[PDB]
Design a protein around this ligand. Structure first.
Ligand code: ATP
Ligand code: ATP
Ligand code: ATP
Lengths: 529, 512, 519
């Protein structure tokens, strides 16, 4: 035969496709879990990047093989669907191929394996949805306080766990707003975590409102105001210019003087229109003139200068005000009355050590707050801010999706017993397809036990010993919803520990891994050109 | 191709042990020299550990990570880079607990990070406060680096250069006491003169020469002006080029070039200045209208050097040359001077105060002597920076290593669990710093190190160190071998941060 | 130059066990296809060049003789299987290697072999108590006689054979042959002989000892066959006139002694014939052939003689008559003579056959086969030997279990359910012990040519519904209740096969280092 390449068919292309796919699983085997190990990503230039996140591992992993190129696209179907889950699809689907490769040597055609996998996947969603938990127990009943306390144990904040877990539980429930037909989700923006030196870490206070890290300057102006109008503006009340790169020409020396007198006179006209609206809360990015601050201490307007731009975007979103970029309305100068102003209740200049902050209370629609992490030095405050941010996203991603499931090895250990008893109920050349589907789901506690420095033959088997008793008899002495605590090396209940996972990350993982294992198993011939 | 499993856990160990075995004998005042062979036959006999690994190419990804973590550590502090790579290679060298015991690295990292908290707690117990107000105590700290140098003839004057430079940059009002030598203490070299001529002035010096005598020579009230825009032909928003090849194009371009520059130069001379400073370049025709007003032309200055000029006099940074005003004045400056120093012209905007900036002026008989002082003073400035950052010293010369390793042995008797076995290995890995000091001296290492541990057990742990000159054990309270605390704090921190990075790597894969 | 081994063959660790596990499978592959009644036979030739055709697992392993050390550990278990129960060497050889196959990936992952030892001792001890619970005693169930039940199990064992059409006649003869024996049952007592020619209906059952009788010498028209109480003599002496061993050569040069020389050579034959006449032996049986002159001697003395008897049939005659085999003739007396009630020379199959009936120690029988080929009768002899074996074990042991993989698929279901309730290292090992016991219904589908995956997937689905005695069928290509179809096996042989296969699998796993002495 004279063709334009090399041809190879048979079972030898089946064994070569599963050995190339399971080798990619070994790249993401040790990096699974919160205790996952780092791996070096050698570039073609010569530099190396140390990443342990499995989503960034498969993005930079370049294997020029079509069996490994199939597993590259499921990372793009995972983040666009839910956003998490990625490498748990890879270890499941590669162990699905390795168990199915043993079936090819045992005189089973893969057509019974493909049709058996789709019925094993649909029955896996049925057993999961019959054992779910509705998104509730937000107040009064803990699986939360204890849920965020496990994430906080790795840092120095974990000495007083009950003191700091209450600051993140009430902050998560404060940022809840439906806003579409009764959705309620949680926004990507969260509470602003500031820091100060309050002589110990025990002086943190849960402030129910946003706190600005700015100082008002003068003292003769009163710090306690009662009016509700809040003004936000981006144009500078200082001496203005045309452009940083384009300038106006000044030829005569006396012509230079009269534009300076006009700058002192046009500042008197702009302050007449701002204070006519009644707005006392004045926040200016570009700064406030020195003679303009003289008019604010007699009128009683709480003027704050040199405010950050990203802080003002959360302030204008709080009171529902509009950010004004330029004060000139394309032919003259106006203040845009009753448009850029919001409503509030009380703004107090609270005495906080080394940074006197500005707190706002009862705005229009903010739902945000602030946590003042008072401490001793910059070492303990910077590590506690990232601990609050890591504990915020744990409680956030759970209480969004409308129902959750106790995860961390509790899902796959319960599915290994039900799908085996379901496999003995069908027959018809698909019993071995579902029985090997149950053993292929056991690699999720198997890789978690070897990463927790425990005996993998004991820790996985302790999960299945408790999940089998839930199916034998419905008595309450059977332990139900048993998770995997990788820290102590002992299985515990996920309802008491608060370890929860969304359902859409668990359903779409079993859906995508079986469809990826179907496509590689359908390859029986190789053609190259 | 690819490699995973336990082979990369042993492969990264031998990659870091090979780098540590090269510069192991280059520790102390008796540091052995190393000979580098070039492809062109050149040979450099430098014993500096930063100079050896820079001129040696590596191919291992773990060995490449070993050099860059000490190179960044050299930019932070100017001392202690050799002790980092030695300690990072000794902590990974006991592979009996890594491979033979079949232990996961997570047990080792939980034992290594728990031993990191005992590094900071032990060094604060053997510390000693420093009377930084006395200049005699500051001379006994910087003298460890001035020995065996050409600057050692003028140690009484070279110590006044580095001490006055760090105190002006350090701001006590901010609380955190920041010192940055690269920006606020920019060192410049001037040929000519002697070593005694080198002094410290309170200002910023401009190395631009004087090309015309129609300039300001001595001005008591300098009127300074800062500008960001360029002084050249007007370019458009497109990317067109300027090419003058025809006589008709030569007249039309130069008439537009003269009319725009004279319109720009009329706005700066209406305020009657003394020196002009532009961010971009100044053309030749722009100096023709500038020399009629007798203004010193200073061009080609960076944006980072521009704010040091604005904080020296108090001027305003103006973006465009048409938008000058009367507030752009330099009232309060000391004197403007364009006086030549060794047939090189330098502009002086110095003052009689501390305007949050300074410079170092070096002089010498030849240009090789100029390069000798600037590499000794910059090494001396970072050591004296760590003393003023925190006035605390530690007993150096291996005394702090045996004091730390003694505290880990008594702590390991109360540390139960599986992690107590790699916890005791860090105590024996920290003994490699007094181990190589005796081996470089030439005495019996194990005969002296065993009596060194017996002195650290019964007697006080703050004394009985090693002297790297005679080869015996002396008391550290008698000799000035005291090390700064912030150097030894970041040394054990980086050696743990290197060992937490190389032991956590479990796979090496390729891909662009 | 100073070595510690210097030719010493020794190795230890994990791959010494993997080399011993895979070396166990080469012995199981030699007897993998011989399992089942429809199994394939193996061809073994010795050093002399004689080809042996047999499918019995006991005869294959006795002629293999593999010099591997782990292969020698499967030989003495097959030897102890013959002493403990009597047969089952091919069942414990296949079952021992499949225990090591399922735990072969578990050893390579770092699991210690001593934990697998603790799991094999646990699950086999549970398999002993699980067999005795499901085993039912069938003695007088449904008020049917035991003679009718013994013809039913032999009907299924002789099904799908050459005599599958006339199996109703052959089932009644194998029951009465064991019923003719005493309480001490033995397969060696009932012999099978073959007679060439005739249809399958002419097969007869001799109550006593009958042999081939290849004596084709003279001796017709005399020596009457019917005797009331004859004296059975078992000799090993040649009675020819010119024999290869009994002769007399004297070299004299006188014509007077030349008459005496031939007379002395005749007196060797005549005195050996006169001692049988004094002892009163009516029938003369000898291993060596008997000449035509000695047949004329007993013709006038009213006696019978028949030579060319094999020594195997002479020892069966000794156990029937109760006498003793005497080689010489001067020691022939009544202490070694036998007795019977009916002796006759029959003409079944065209050839002459002798048989005794009515012995005082008549504990042996003889089965006569008729057919158009000897290889038809050779496979009929082994099938009727299998039909006797199922009948014999039903009389000795009443507590039986369902064969055909029904007790193997039920033990695979209980041990899988026990493993789900046990945490620790005993879950993945006992669960692999239950899957390793499924090789008996799997190799029964492989040797029968059926679909091995289509039956076993429907067999485990039948056991999941509640079927406790469902197995494979050798006739139909589907599953059937082996308790209703009378496919039985005793519980004691199923227990002793499990404790021998677990002990043979434990002896391989407990060995980690091989010591060899250089000599
Ligand atoms: N709180 C927890 N307790 C115990 N186990 C957990 C917990 N959270 C996550 N896990 C386990 O860690 C695994 C997640 O691994 P990792 O985060 O390294 O990658 P991944 O998120 O699976 O990859 P991808 O982003 O594609 O899905 C899950 O399989 C889960 O079982
Ligand atoms: N006479 C001596 N005997 C023993 N030890 C000494 C003696 N003099 C100095 N030392 C110690 O030797 C140390 C220097 O060791 P080493 O050469 O390994 O580091 P280094 O090269 O100075 O560090 P860096 O590269 O950061 O400058 C000093 O910190 C000092 O405490
Ligand atoms: N008539 C039959 N129908 C179905 N299965 C049978 C029948 N006879 C035997 N078997 C099955 O065959 C298996 C044994 O096959 P085989 O007769 O080849 O070995 P064996 O000679 O019994 O072994 P051993 O001599 O060690 O007992 C038994 O497990 C039994 O269940």
């Amino acid at each position: 035969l004279s063709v334009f390449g090399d041809r190879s068919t048979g079972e030898t292309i089946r064994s070569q496709n599963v050995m190339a796919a399971a080798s990619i699983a070994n790249i993401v085997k040790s990096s699974l879990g919160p205790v996952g190990l780092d791996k070096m990503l050698v570039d073609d230039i010569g530099d190396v990047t140390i990443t342990n996140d499995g989503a960034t591992i498969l993005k930079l992993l370049e294997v020029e093989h079509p069996a490994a190129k199939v597993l590259c696209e499921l990372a793009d179907l995972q983040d666009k669907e839910v956003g998490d889950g990625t490498t748990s699809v890879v270890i499941i689907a590669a162990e699905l191929l390795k168990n199915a490769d043993e079936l090819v040597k045992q005189k089973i055609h893969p057509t019974s394996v493909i049709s058996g996998y789709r019925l094993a996947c649909k029955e896996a969603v049925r057993y999961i949805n019959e054992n779910l938990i509705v998104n509730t127990d937000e107040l009064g009943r803990d699986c939360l306080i204890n849920a965020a306390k496990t994430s906080m144990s790795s840092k120095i904040i974990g000495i007083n766990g009950d003191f700091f877990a209450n600051m993140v539980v009430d902050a998560v429930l404060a940022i809840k707003y439906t806003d579409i037909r009764g959705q309620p989700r949680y926004p990507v923006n969260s509470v602003n975590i500031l820091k100060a030196h309050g002589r110990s870490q025990m002086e943190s206070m849960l402030i129910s409102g946003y706190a600005l890290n700015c100082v008002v300057g003068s003292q003769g102006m009163p710090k306690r105001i009662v009016n509700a109008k809040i003004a936000c503006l981006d144009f500078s009340l200082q001496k203005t210019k045309m452009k940083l790169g384009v300038q106006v020409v000044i030829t005569d020396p006396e012509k230079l003087d009269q534009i300076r007198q006009r700058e002192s006179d046009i500042t008197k006209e702009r302050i007449q229109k701002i204070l006519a609206t009644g707005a006392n809360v004045i926040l200016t990015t570009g700064g406030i003139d020195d003679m303009c601050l003289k008019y604010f201490v007699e009128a009683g307007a709480m003027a704050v200068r040199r405010v950050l731009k990203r802080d003002l975007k959360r302030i204008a979103k709080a009171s529902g005000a509009t950010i004004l970029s330029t004060l000139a309305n394309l032919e003259g100068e106006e203040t845009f009355e009753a448009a850029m102003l919001g409503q509030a209740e009380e703004v107090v200049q609270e005495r906080i050590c080394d940074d006197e902050l500005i707190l706002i209370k009862n705005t229009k629609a903010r739902t945000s707050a602030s946590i003042i992490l008072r401490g001793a030095n910059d070492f303990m405050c910077d590590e506690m801010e990232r601990s609050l941010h890591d504990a915020l996203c744990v409680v956030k991603r759970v209480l969004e999706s409308k129902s959750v499931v106790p995860g961390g090895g509790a899902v796959e250990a319960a599915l290994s017993i039900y799908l085996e008893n379901y496999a003995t109920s069908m027959g018809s050349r698909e019993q071995l397809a579902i029985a090997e589907f149950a053993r292929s789901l056991l690699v999720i506690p198997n890789t978690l036990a070897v990463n927790a420095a425990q005996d993998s033959t004991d820790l996985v088997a302790k999960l299945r010993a408790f999940h089998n008793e839930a199916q034998v008899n419905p008595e309450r002495k059977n332990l139900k919803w048993i998770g995997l605590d990788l820290s102590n090396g002992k299985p515990r209940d996920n309802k008491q520990a608060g370890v929860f996972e969304p359902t859409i990350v668990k359903v779409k993982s079993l859906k995508f891994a079986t469809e990826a294992a179907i496509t590689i198993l359908r390859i029986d011939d190789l053609i190259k050109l | 191709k690819r490699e995973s499993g336990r082979k990369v856990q042993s492969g990264n160990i031998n990659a870091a042990k090979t780098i540590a075995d090269i510069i192991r004998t280059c520790l102390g005042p008796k540091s052995m020299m190393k000979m580098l062979l070039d492809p062109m036959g050149g040979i450099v006999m430098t014993n500096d550990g930063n100079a050896i690994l820079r001129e040696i190419q590596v191919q291992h990804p773990a060995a490449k990570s070993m050099i860059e973590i000490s190179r960044t550590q050299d930019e932070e502090v100017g001392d202690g880079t050799t002790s980092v790579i030695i300690l990072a290679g000794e902590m990974l060298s006991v592979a009996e607990h890594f491979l033979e015991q079949q232990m996961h690295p997570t047990v080792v990292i939980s034992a290594y990070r728990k031993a990191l908290d005992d590094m900071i707690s032990t060094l604060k117990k053997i510390s000693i406060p420093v009377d930084i107000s006395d200049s005699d105590m500051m001379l006994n700290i910087i003298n460890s680096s001035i020995t065996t140098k050409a600057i050692s003839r003028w140690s009484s004057l070279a110590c006044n250069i580095a001490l006055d430079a760090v105190k002006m940059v350090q701001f006590e009002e901010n609380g955190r006491k920041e010192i940055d030598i690269k920006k606020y203490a920019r060192v410049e070299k001037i040929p000519g003169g002697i070593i005694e001529d080198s002094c410290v002035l309170r200002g910023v010096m401009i190395n631009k020469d004087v090309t015309h005598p129609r300039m300001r020579r001595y001005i008591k009230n300098p009127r300074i002006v800062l500008l960001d825009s360029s002084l050249e032909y007007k370019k458009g928003e497109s990317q067109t080029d300027i090419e003058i090849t025809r006589e008709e194009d030569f007249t039309r371009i130069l008439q537009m070039e003269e009319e725009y520059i004279q319109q720009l130069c009329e706005d700066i001379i209406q305020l009657k200045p003394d020196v002009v400073i532009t961010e971009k370049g100044i053309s030749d025709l722009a100096q023709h209208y500038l020399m009629r007003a007798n203004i010193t032309a200073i061009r080609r200055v960076r944006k980072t050097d521009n704010n040091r000029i604005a904080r020296a006099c108090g001027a305003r940074i103006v973006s465009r040359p048409e938008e000058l005003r009367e507030d752009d004045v330099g009232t309060g400056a000391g004197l403007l001077e364009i006086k030549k120093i060794g047939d090189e012209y330098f502009t002086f905007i110095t003052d009689c105060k501390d305007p949050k900036a300074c410079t170092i002026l070096l002089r010498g008989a030849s240009k090789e002597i100029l390069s000798e002082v600037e590499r000794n003073l910059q090494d001396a400035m970072q050591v004296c920076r760590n003393v003023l950052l925190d006035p605390q010293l530690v007993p150096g010369g291996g005394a702090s290593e045996m004091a730390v390793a003694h505290a880990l042995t008594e702590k390991s008797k109360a540390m139960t669990g599986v992690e107590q076995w790699p916890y005791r290995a860090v105590a024996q890995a920290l003994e490699v710093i007094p181990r190589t000091l005796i081996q470089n001296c030439g005495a019996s290492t194990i005969r002296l190190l065993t009596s060194l541990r017996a002195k650290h057990t019964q007697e006080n742990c703050e004394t009985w160190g090693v002297n790297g000159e005679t080869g015996t054990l002396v008391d550290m309270k008698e000799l000035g071998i005291w090390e700064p605390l912030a150097v030894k704090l970041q040394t054990y921190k980086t050696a743990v941060e290197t060992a937490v990075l190389l032991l956590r790597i479990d796979d090496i894969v390729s891909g662009h | 130059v100073i070595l510690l081994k210097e030719g010493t063959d020794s190795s230890q660790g994990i791959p010494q066990l993997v080399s011993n596990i895979s070396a166990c499978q080469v012995i199981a592959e030699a007897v993998r296809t011989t399992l089942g009644p429809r199994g394939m036979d193996k061809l073994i030739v010795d050093g002399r060049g004689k080809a042996t055709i047999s499918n019995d697992g006991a005869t294959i392993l006795k002629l293999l003789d593999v010099v591997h050390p782990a292969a020698k550990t499967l030989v003495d278990i097959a030897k102890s299987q013959d002493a403990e129960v009597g047969d089952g060497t091919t069942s414990v050889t296949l079952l021992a290697a499949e225990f090591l196959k399922q735990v072969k990936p578990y050893v390579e992952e770092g699991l210690h072999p001593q934990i697998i030892i603790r799991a094999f001792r646990t699950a086999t001890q549970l398999a002993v108590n699980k067999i005795k619970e499901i085993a039912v005693t069938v003695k007088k169930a449904d008020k049917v006689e035991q003679r009718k039940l013994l013809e039913k199990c032999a009907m299924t064992a002789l099904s799908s054979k050459l005599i599958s059409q006339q199996k109703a006649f052959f089932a009644k003869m194998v029951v009465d042959a064991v019923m003719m024996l005493d309480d001490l049952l033995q397969l060696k007592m009932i012999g099978i002989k073959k007679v060439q020619g005739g249809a399958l209906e002419d097969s007869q059952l001799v109550a006593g000892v009958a042999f081939k009788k290849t004596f084709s010498y003279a001796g017709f028209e005399m020596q009457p066959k019917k005797y009331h109480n004859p004296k059975i003599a078992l000799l090993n002496v040649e009675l020819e006139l010119k024999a290869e061993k009994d002769n007399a050569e004297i070299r004299v040069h006188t014509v007077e002694d030349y008459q005496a020389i031939v007379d002395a050579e005749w007196n060797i034959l005549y005195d050996k014939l006169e001692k049988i006449h004094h002892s009163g032996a009516k029938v003369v049986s000898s291993k060596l052939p008997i000449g035509d002159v000695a047949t004329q001697y007993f013709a006038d003395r009213d006696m019978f003689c028949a030579g060319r008897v094999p020594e195997e049939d002479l020892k069966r005659t000794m156990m029937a008559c109760g006498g003793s085999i005497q080689t010489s003739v001067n020691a022939l007396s009544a202490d070694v003579l036998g007795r019977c009630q009916v002796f006759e020379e029959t003409q079944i199959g065209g050839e002459r056959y002798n048989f005794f009936t009515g012995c005082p120690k008549a504990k042996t029988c003889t089965f006569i086969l008729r057919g158009g080929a000897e290889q038809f009768m050779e496979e009929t002899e082994r099938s009727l030997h299998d039909a006797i074996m199922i009948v014999r074990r039903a009389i000795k042991n009443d507590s039986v279990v369902a064969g055909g993989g029904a007790i193997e698929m039920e033990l695979s279901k209980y041990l899988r359910d026990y493993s789900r309730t046990i945490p620790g290292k005993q879950q993945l090992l006992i669960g692999a012990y239950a899957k390793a016991l499924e090789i008996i219904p799997r190799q029964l589908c492989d040797n029968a040519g059926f679909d091995a995956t289509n039956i076993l997937n429907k067999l485990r689905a039948r056991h999941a519904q509640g079927g406790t005695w469902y197995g494979v069928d050798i006739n139909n290509e589907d599953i059937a209740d082996n308790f209703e179809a009378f496919v039985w096996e005793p519980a004691m042989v199923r227990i002793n096969a499990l404790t021998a296969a677990s002990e043979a699998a434990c002896l391989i796993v407990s060995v980690d280092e091989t010591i060899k002495n250089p000599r």
